[PDB]
Assembly symmetry: D2
Homo-oligomer: 329 residues x 4
């Protein structure tokens, strides 16, 4: 039962043109540290929003699967191979941050443009305008800044980057609470799994016991409700987005990687409820650096079908739940 | 903590040609009764398998969305409008049951064949051969029988129809348990929601507290395990299907219905874990009889965004969890 | 081909169904047999005279990686697997998917009822609606699918009114101008490379040759000629709004799942050259792209004819021509 | 069109990028202006001489229901929304998606920075890779997209080397045979019905006319003629294996989401008539089908020209011809 963080009602607010916007390097509430060679993370925000962008930079490039769900997807690129993933606020306007990343990467490549040297950035967005009283959005300059701020082995938890103005629980805006962004990391032997998430759900964040921990908080009661209780009573009366990434170092074929993405994404309906709704633009990127082979056969002491991409997906699903809970903390 | 129902190892077994197969009307462990005009359910099995088929008959026809996930889908038709949904065992061979339904419906239509009089049956299957020691599968005659046995307002819970030899928890077959089929029903005002499920998951059935209730039972310990505990230890050591239907009477557009299907299907990763894996052929049919309008605006005392298809999806997700728990009981 | 200019109007359309008849499968021989050299690939074609309707089965007993491309609002598909031991094409609209169950059951029996997951016999099936072209309600049933498998012959294909093509037809702006088509196949061997195309065109649109001439469908008995449907459509709009094809490519060239899928889409779209309109809401157009995984593409795509000349796209372009030839055989 | 037979080889391809230049947007006028009567639809085209590269923006301020059809292995798409206030087509490969951000930001400013979910300004963008056709690394940036919006003119389209078409090219079996294309548009009014096609063909394949003649791309300077790529591909295989197009249709006819989506697929596939090969792994082919929802189809599909003559499929067939005309304008 954490203390509430109600977003409150928005107030006609100023947009980008009204300000000389200074990027700020986001530090969040605390820094997660981890060991994942070849992966860097940067996060930048404008205090003016507040709104921001979070960039996962994999300079060598990495094979990717994208799983998009719901009626409000805001996606650019969605490539099967990426040098960066850019997550941002600002609704569709915030896809501009990824253009800032792309242009910067072209500069770093000394303006080479061979079809194979193309720098590929996939971007996804949350609508974060109800949670504040301005129209500032992540722009090209903010995406460039997030890339510039990227470093190996660090992630700023909470109100940082794309998570500045993320919020949950939207049966009614009077009960919506600020979330954040979150990350979690596990290493098993040589295997590495990093989960990054920016939950801006219509639904609420739920822990492993089934407790609603963030979103749909009623100030009249002091208690959070699972949305289904509201929905069911609404029917009886009246009749008559989360953007995320997994990054791993395990080699998976295109088909395995795509099904892994679907599996991990669906697993997030455990910690976010409802999820994958028409109201949401839920988008997960599954990224592999293609470093570690799975064994040719899937046995172990733990079972005949225990070491495969599905197994990896189950583990990664837990890392992602932990990240969602970090974002809601 | 229910008593175990381990499937045990399969034993070269006989197939359909070896028997004079008599359809049996499946009664299960108990009958669910409900009120849903225009919907009938029949279930038939062969004791010889044991294996069976469950048919949802909507004689007027109903708009449908199909959501298929994983690497082992076995689907026929997958139509956007159906007179029947046929769920069966027998792996891909059991898709034949749906042909029995289709042919019977043509007969009932007096052999009319105008493109608009076409009788549309969508079928999906589970692989149920590891859970028994024969190669008998649901054939045309069994599908016809299931249709013949269909009645309004009844569903046979447990080991009935397609659920005869369904099983869960397949990290290792020594720990796999027999499930069944399940159904649940809710009425809210005029709104009706029926969930039908045949869980044959690689994963396990999980209740709302997070307890593993069916699948991955270790006879050496007397306890069921969430598969992720096995998977994670397998990695540390070695490196280095569910078919379902919702049926409702609420009018939804094609787009709403499709997103509703996705939402409800993903919600099942709460009660089945892992879910939507490469190993699974998970297929959900969302069917509406298009009887009840939702209101033009989505408000109620419960919230400004409380009465819409997403709301319906959240409610239906709970009905489906209840059905999954019925199947595992 | 030399297409026969003569009309073959289907005519209009209280039809009897399967059990009204003592249905004996007939091995379809069509108008002519195509012979092709592609070890591992057999084709069987069976029909019921009483429809007339039929099924055509491509049997690849090793199993072969497959991509499925389905378009339009009227798809009738079973299985649609990424690996198949057989592809079953049939008449009878959705009822004719039953033929593929006949194939599946027969293959299980041939496998001595083994049911290990790696032993599952996988059949993908697709259908055309062929009831407008005849009075009956007879459809390709499980017996007919089993018969088409039993009748499969290595390296032979019956052109014309045979198997699934027995009551196929084209050009459906008005049924008075619809003509019977058939099924068709074509084959090319280029070096070591083998490409087989099989098609059962039952289009809303018409069959068009490489010169742009409409050669089958939309025959107006009042004019004696076939014109493109667009002329009828444009005249219809000016007046009233005043101010399926099922097919397979089979090749022996190794393609990854991703390459094979995009090859399928390319070849399928290429068929809008020979069938117009195509991929419509009215159509259940479904193409299966199958590779037997026998021969590698070179690791680099060069030749004397260009730096990007030997790759899956190039193979797709070649296969597209084989498919157009098959479409013209069906319409001949 | 009368296509110019003369070659326009792109030539081969250490190129400077955007900030190397003081980049002034130029309003593109192309070779000729198409004028069309479609209230609510404007087109702006802007280029940078220093590329040369550009962007073409279709501005529909009411917003319009859209279906997106994307094919191939090289798609470069932003938004891909089911409802759009603008469509932005650009060069610069994935970098040129930035032009659409310029459009989006400008539209937000025009909306006085209102951000209610029902007020969100939705821009879908798609790109061609046009860097082989020039030395520079200049790409359509946010300023260029904003300029293309600012330059939008109701009912006018600049044909040829203009906007996104400034460095578009066709026929990429070998770059030595690649020719500059352009952008193209065509428009038809039939009764009350309006159909606009816009295309930016940068294909791997070639542009083909209705007679089957290759008219742009794969020009062999050693022969003086263009032949179909398949001749090169087949010769390449015999030797070595021995024994993007971005486009939009815009119409005023009401179509449901399902009809509009299948219309998009039909029209897109129809472009394999005029662009061959098409929908290849090599291509990022993306078509936007947009309806302004002004006029109903009749409730029944009859006319004197047939019982199934007035429906979305019929509209698709008509629109397919408008699109082929646009492709030929681009290649002229
Ligand atoms: Cl929000
Ligand atoms: Cl927890
Ligand atoms: Cl199993
Ligand atoms: Cl429970
Ligand atoms: Cl027909
Ligand atoms: Cl045989
Ligand atoms: Cl190019
Ligand atoms: Cl303007």
């Amino acid at each position: 039962d954490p203390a509430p963080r109600l977003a409150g009602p928005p107030v006609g607010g100023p947009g980008n043109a009204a300000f000389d916007l200074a990027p700020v390097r986001s530090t969040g509430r605390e820094m997660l540290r981890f060991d994942f060679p070849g992966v860097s993370i940067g996060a930048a925000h404008y205090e003016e929003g507040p709104t921001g962008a979070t960039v996962i930079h994999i300079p060598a490039g990495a094979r990717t699967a994208v799983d998009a769900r719901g009626g409000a997807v805001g996606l650019s690129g969605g490539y099967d191979f990426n040098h960066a993933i850019c997550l941002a606020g600002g609704a569709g306007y915030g896809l501009e941050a990824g253009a800032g990343v792309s242009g910067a990467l072209l500069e770093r490549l000394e303006y080479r443009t061979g079809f194979a040297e193309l720098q590929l950035v996939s971007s996804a967005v949350i609508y974060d305008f109800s949670a504040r009283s301005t129209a500032v959005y992540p722009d090209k300059a903010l995406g460039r800044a997030a890339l510039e701020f990227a470093v190996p082995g660090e992630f700023p938890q909470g109100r940082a980057g794309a998570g500045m103005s993320a919020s949950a629980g939207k049966v009614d805006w009077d009960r919506t609470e600020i979330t954040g962004q979150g990350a979690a990391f596990r290493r098993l032997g040589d295997v590495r799994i990093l989960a990054v998430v920016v939950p801006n759900p219509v639904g609420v964040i739920v822990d492993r016991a089934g407790t609603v921990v963030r979103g749909n908080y009623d100030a009249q009661t002091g208690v959070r409700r699972h949305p289904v209780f509201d929905y069911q009573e609404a029917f009886a009366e009246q009749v008559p987005t989360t953007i995320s990434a997994i990054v791993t170092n395990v080699r998976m074929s295109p088909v395995e990687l795509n099904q892994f993405a679907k599996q991990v994404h669906s697993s997030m309906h455990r910690g976010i409820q409802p999820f994958h709704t028409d109201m949401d633009g839920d988008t997960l990127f599954a990224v592999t650096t293609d470093e570690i082979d799975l064994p040719t056969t899937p046995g172990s002491s733990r079972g005949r079908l225990s070491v495969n991409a599905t197994a990896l997906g189950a583990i990664a699903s837990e890392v992602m739940w932990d990240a969602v809970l970090e974002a809601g903390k």
